[PDB]
Amino acid sequence: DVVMTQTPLTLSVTIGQPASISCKSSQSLLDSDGKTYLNWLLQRPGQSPKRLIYLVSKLDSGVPDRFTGSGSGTDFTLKISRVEAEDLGVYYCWQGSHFPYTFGGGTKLEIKRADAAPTVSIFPPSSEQLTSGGASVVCFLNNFYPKDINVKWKIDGSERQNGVLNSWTDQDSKDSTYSMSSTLTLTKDEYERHNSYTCEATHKTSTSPIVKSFNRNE
Amino acid sequence: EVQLEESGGRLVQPKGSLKLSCAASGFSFNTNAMNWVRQAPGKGLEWVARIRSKINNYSTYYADSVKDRFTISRDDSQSMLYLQMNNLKTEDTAMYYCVRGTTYWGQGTLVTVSAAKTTPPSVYPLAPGSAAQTNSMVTLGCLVKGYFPEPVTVTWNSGSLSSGVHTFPAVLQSDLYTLSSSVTVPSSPRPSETVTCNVAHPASSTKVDKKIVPRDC
Ligand SMILES: [Ca+2]
Ligand SMILES: [Ca+2]
């Protein structure tokens, strides 16, 4: 099987700045008929892939001239002259020359934006949940950048590491920011024999972390 | 316009069987080679199977990992592409796309191969405890816990609240998914104007509405 190697794995580019991505094959994609079947596809978040380039350099209909495909044999390049917000997603090279028809591992194009501190919100377990025997404490860390953040959970001043589930949104379609959800799950009993619940957010925007807390009864 | 619509995706037990379908329209289906491409949760694209046109006697090709287990076929009279999958394995869990040549991709159909059983979620409102009064913006949410398989969709005020919504991807903890959604609105609307999340787990035919109500005593 032809091995398709895509680099970089991720890149972070300022809107209006150029981007160049590589795709290499373990063997020449020049087919028996003299044509080179190397496509470039873009997968936008939540969307199915869309082909941008085919036959190394041919642009698909309704694909801006900002995209340029180049190369031959085993070495291929996708270049974006100046990036736009809509370019964010994972780019794939797909070879159709030799069977099995292989794909590169993907290159995630991220939009570089200014730093932004998260806005933090804390939520106690709902009554619905307590009645069911579980207790989840939630923290939303909204509209921050960069993605890299640390969330610390504290029960009556003491740090809890187990029962913590974290999820990040994709870059905001208008903002390019991230949001994050941090769920601390503990038994209804454990929750009730404790009063102070705190989530601490350490982001590069401040040396001091963003703290949000609540007390069962106040 | 060219349309490719996949049908069939769902939860199957390991060693089980599932047939996927793809309805093609807006092009000469009978003159096109058709492919199936899959994408494992959070992974890259993986080519699965290819079928040539009638002119090329419907020759079929398969990736090594699915050869002898998967059967690609087509019904030109109905412009239907099919993928019969026998002896399913957990690593076959993926979103399956119908592709016209290497040109147009359908929406995809999710296939979950697991011993875990269909479990509807529990829908919990996220309301602030006694949080900051003169806070111009108020953040509310919905915690959607203990479901299987994916997906789950969250909508706020039946799709009216679009701006200010953050939908967090599901995280699988112990054969059960957990997802959350948040909504940020001015302090003028809620509490006065009600806030409700609409949760749908199609796999268990669950549609749950949770009104976000201020925390009582
Ligand atoms: Ca092989
Ligand atoms: Ca060939």
Looking at residue B15, which CATH number applies to its domain? 2.60.40.10
Size of chain B, expressed as the number of residues it contains:
217
- Cα–Cα distance, A149 to A204 (Å, whole number): 8
Whether omega before A8 lies within 30 degrees of 0, making that bond cis, reads yes
Q: Is B122 found in the same domain as B71? A: no
Q: Burial of B63 by CB count in 10 Å (0-12 exposed, 13-18 middle, 19+ buried)?
A: buried
**Cβ–Cβ contact B108 with A under 8 A:** yes
- Count of H-run helices and E-run strands, chain A: 2, 18
The DSSP letter of residue A116 is B
Q: Is B107 found in the same domain as B9? A: yes
- Name the minimum distance, in Å, from the CA of A146 to any CA of chain B: 17
Asked if the Cβ–Cβ distance from B124 to A136 is below 8 Å, we say yes
Q: Which of B91, B115, B139 is the last residue of a domain?
A: B115
Identify which of B145, B50, B33 has the alpha carbon closest to the alpha carbon of residue A183.
B145
Identify whether the C-beta of residue B183 lies closer than 8 Å to the C-beta of residue B143.
no
Can you list the positions of beta strands (E) in A44-163? 50-54, 58-59, 67-72, 75-80, 89-95, 107-112, 119-123, 134-144, 150-155, 158-160
Q: CA angle, corner B114, sides to B108 and B115, nearest 5?
A: 155
At how many Å resolution was this determined? Answer: 2.3
Q: CB A94: neighbour CB atoms within 10 A?
A: 23
- Cα–Cα distance, B25 to B70 (Å, whole number): 24
Q: Is B75 found in the same domain as B160? A: no
Q: CB B142: neighbour CB atoms within 10 A?
A: 26
**Cβ–Cβ contact A179 with B under 8 A:** yes
Asked if the Cβ–Cβ distance from B143 to A138 is below 8 Å, we say yes
What range defines the domain where residue B162 resides?
116-213
Experimentally determined by: X-ray
Q: CB A151: neighbour CB atoms within 10 A?
A: 21
**Cβ–Cβ contact A134 with B under 8 A:** yes
What range defines the domain where residue A96 resides?
1-113
Q: Which of B94, B115, B136 is the last residue of a domain?
A: B115
Identify which of A36, A104, A37, A91 has the alpha carbon closest to the alpha carbon of residue A63.
A91
